[PDB]
Nucleic acid binder design. Structure first.
Lengths: 137, 120, 123, 135, 60, 217
RNA sequence: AGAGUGUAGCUUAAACAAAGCACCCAACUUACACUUAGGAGAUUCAAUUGACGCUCUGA
């Protein structure tokens, strides 16, 4: 006996009438990337995710907090381009990179990180440790 | 004492861990993610960030790799993650970039070997 | 007939027996820092040059292709048989023979000395 | 399982290979030149641009090289030279596309080269094996 | 054009191959890398069917 | 609906001499020569040279140089061919000698009742004939000398129209294998020319489409 | 002269930013391919609205 498939079966978008024209997986890493994105995509058949995943609600997570500042993205990217092109125009960074001896100030990196986008990483860490679900339900 | 998912011996990623390191280097940038077996990230690092990119010449060289390694080790031993696991391919492990990356991490104070589960 | 015919060895993929002598070896002059820097800069500049070359090649070939296809579709719309006639192949266009350019053009009146040639090959 | 809609989800053999005009048979391309390195570089460029154009390429191989001795008899003088031969096999090139293909090849052709393009014949394939005299 | 000419010798354990000129029967000149530092080789001619022409070119 | 259909041939003469390399190209060529002599292995020349130098060193306590000197003197004696011809570039614009490094194409002096135009040769097509037929008809008509223009394709390469009533010319491509410049006195001023001064010469916008179509290289 | 359009070649990507893919040089490979180590790239100007570039439609 047979039954129709509920959802669109995999490997159905490809055409097999034409096979040699098609591009092939020439790298395990390409295949792996495809596989990971497929796995993170949802599916109609039963899968590992709907057994061993927390089953977060589909609705939004309410947070009436401090919104971001209104930063002028145009001049922000302009200053960033000025900075990167000045760095590229600098002269010693070439030898530094091509001899593998350079470094970076950890303190400055930490300060700029916690100023710019630290809070998002800290929110991620908090929701991992379970502070939010336990405090604010 | 926790249980780690023992099994999957047939498939390449061995999920018998608690905190895994996944490194993705593209032809434009390089990122390193420390996540749980749940597939959910616990901490991240990426050359895409302006704080790290302003100080650097190229986002893809061995210098960038080892710098991301050092920064990620800093973040890890800040977040208490002193032990973690890494499943590289043969060439990915033989590469000098990832070798120097894991060396930087070890000297930063994080070992890429996870303790053996206890239960008697 | 059913025997697996052997293939004539290629003398380019066979290092002469008289290439392994240790008497040939030359002293290797260690390279200078500035010279190696020059080499690397040269390599990256030439890589940029070659990618620009292939960029303009892509542009040229794409323009030629799209123009040819415009002409083809116009001819198809106008004459519904001459486009098929053009799509037809032709055997005289398959066998071609051509030479490469020369360091200098041929001399008008130049005769070489009197000599002969003889080919030498092995099985 | 067969009865259920999940049947046939794992099969791959139909994906992988099993083992008139505007349809050009297998064509061969000979490249004869005195410079083995020039010949190899030109063949490599051809193979790379073919892969870029997504045109099929069966195989590329070297024909047996040959050395010729030239001697001038004014007094007796001698000299020798070598000649190397590369070969490529292609197929599936469209009619109008072959025009620009060959044109770009001729244009980028460097000095010290002689290129022939013909239909693949059993003669070429049998000219590679040792000329066994026993037969 | 001619762009893929200048290249690295795609081979290991290669002897000295120095640049040298090669002249064909028409006087056309090309480059070839050759063992010893020559400056030019030249291609001669041997045989045509004309007997009187052969004799004339032998005289002259 | 007064229509008219024309076929035309465009022969592209390839250059016989290599294009003069860029200074970067020549510098990297010298660098490649350096790397090649550095990585290279011994040859018979180096063998005999070093061995006979050591023989002389031994005999002092107890030729290759001559050959290379003779070769240098023979090279200095011999004279090479000409690359560029300053005179022929001006007074012999209708010649091959002016430019041997880049590809060439011709142009004919054509006249029409509505507008006199400097354009590429063409001819009128009739039903019992192929466009390639018209192409070889045009070349056999306008050649007037010993030269063969071999084709390289059957597909159409250019399409260009103009109204007064309607005329539509289709361009095919071809290869130039042989060519001379006999019958120098001609009504149609045939002149082998390159894309740069071709564009400088001729006006039309269909012709500008020809410009962008033809490969510069 | 009028209509449409407009992120590096592709992508209805756009906060924590210009991301991923495509591509190029070198090495191994007969070559390709994989792989390693390196290389360049952009949302035209003023506030989604206008004005600089592109195609099409007429002479």
């Amino acid at each position: 006996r047979r039954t129709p498939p509920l959802g669109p079966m995999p490997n159905s978008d490809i055409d097999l009438s034409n096979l040699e024209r098609l591009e092939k997986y020439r790298s395990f890493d390409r295949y792996r990337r495809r596989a990971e994105q497929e796995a993170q995509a949802p599916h109609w058949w039963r899968t590992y995710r709907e057994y061993f995943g927390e089953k977060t609600d589909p609705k939004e997570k309410i947070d009436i907090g401090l919104p971001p500042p209104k930063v002028s993205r145009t001049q922000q990217l302009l200053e960033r381009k000025q900075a990167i092109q000045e760095l590229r125009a600098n002269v010693e960074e070439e030898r530094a990179a091509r001899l593998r001896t350079a470094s970076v100030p950890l303190d400055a990196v930490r300060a700029e990180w916690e100023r710019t986008c630290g809070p998002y990483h800290k929110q991620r860490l908090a929701e991992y440790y379970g502070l939010y679900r336990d405090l604010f339900h | 004492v926790a249980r780690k998912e023992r099994g999957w011996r047939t498939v390449f990623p061995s999920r018998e861990f608690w905190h895994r390191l996944r490194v993705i280097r593209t032809q434009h940038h390089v990122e390193a993610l420390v996540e749980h077996q749940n597939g959910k990230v616990v901490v991240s690092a990426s050359t895409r960030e302006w704080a790290i990119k302003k100080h650097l010449y190229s986002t893809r060289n061995v210098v960038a790799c080892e710098s991301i390694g050092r920064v990620l080790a800093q973040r890890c031993l800040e977040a208490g993650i002193n032990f973690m696991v890494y499943q590289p391919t043969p060439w990915e492990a033989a590469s000098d970039s990832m070798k120097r990356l894991q060396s930087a991490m070890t000297e930063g104070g994080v070992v890429l070997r996870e303790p053996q589960r206890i239960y008697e | 007939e059913k025997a697996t015919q052997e293939l004539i060895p290629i003398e380019d993929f066979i290092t002469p027996l008289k290439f392994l002598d240790k008497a040939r070896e030359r002293p290797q002059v260690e390279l200078t820092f500035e010279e190696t820097e020059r080499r690397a800069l040269l390599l990256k500049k030439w890589s940029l040059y070659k990618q620009q070359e292939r960029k303009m090649e892509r542009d040229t070939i794409r323009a030629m292709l799209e123009a040819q296809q415009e002409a083809l579709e116009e001819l198809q719309l106008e004459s519904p048989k001459l486009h098929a006639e053009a799509i037809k192949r032709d055997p005289n266009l398959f066998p071609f023979e051509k030479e490469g350019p020369h360091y200098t053009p041929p001399i008008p009146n130049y005769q070489p000395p009197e000599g002969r040639y003889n080919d030498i090959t092995k099985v | 399982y067969k009865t259920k809609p999940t049947h046939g989800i794992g099969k791959y053999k139909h994906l992988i290979k099993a083992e008139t005009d505007y349809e050009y048979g297998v064509l061969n391309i000979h490249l004869t030149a005195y410079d083995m390195t020039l010949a190899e570089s030109y063949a490599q460029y051809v193979h790379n641009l073919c892969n870029s154009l997504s045109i099929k390429v069966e195989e590329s191989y070297a024909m047996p090289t040959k050395t010729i001795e030239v001697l001038q008899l004014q007094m007796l003088l001698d000299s020798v030279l070598t000649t190397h031969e590369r070969v490529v096999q292609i197929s599936g090139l469209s009619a109008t596309f072959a025009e620009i293909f060959l044109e770009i090849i001729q244009s980028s052709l460097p000095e010290g080269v002689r290129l022939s393009v013909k239909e693949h014949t059993e003669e070429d394939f049998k000219g590679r094996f040792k000329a066994r005299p026993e037969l | 054009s001619s762009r893929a000419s200048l290249t690295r010798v795609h081979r290991q354990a290669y002897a000295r191959l120095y640049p040298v000129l090669l002249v064909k029967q028409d006087g056309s000149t090309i480059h070839i890398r050759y063992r010893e530092p020559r400056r030019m080789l030249a291609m001669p001619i041997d045989l045509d069917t004309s007997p009187e022409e052969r004799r004339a070119r032998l005289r002259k | 609906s007064p229509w008219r259909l024309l076929g035309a041939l465009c022969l592209q003469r390839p250059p016989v001499v290599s294009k003069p390399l860029t200074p970067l190209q020549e510098e990297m060529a010298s660098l490649l020569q350096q790397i090649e002599i550095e990585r290279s292995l011994y040859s018979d020349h180096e063998l005999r040279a070093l061995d006979e130098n050591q023989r002389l060193a031994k005999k002092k306590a107890d030729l290759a140089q001559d050959l290379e000197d003779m070769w240098e003197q023979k090279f200095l004696q011999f004279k090479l061919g000409a690359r560029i011809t300053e005179a022929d570039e001006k007074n012999d614009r209708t010649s091959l000698n002016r430019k041997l490094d880049r590809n060439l194409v011709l142009l004919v002096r054509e006249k029409f009742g509505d507008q006199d135009v400097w354009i590429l040769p063409q001819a009128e097509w009739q039903p019992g004939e192929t466009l390639r037929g018209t192409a070889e008809r045009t070349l056999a008509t306008l050649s007037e000398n010993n030269m063969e223009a071999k084709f390289l394709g059957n597909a159409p390469c250019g399409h260009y129209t103009f109204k007064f009533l309607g005329a539509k010319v289709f361009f095919f491509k071809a290869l130039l294998l042989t060519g001379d410049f006999s019958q120098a006195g001609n009504k149609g001023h045939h002149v082998w020319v390159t894309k740069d001064e071709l564009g400088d010469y001729l006006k039309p916008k269909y012709l500008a489409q020809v410009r962008r179509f033809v490969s510069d290289l």
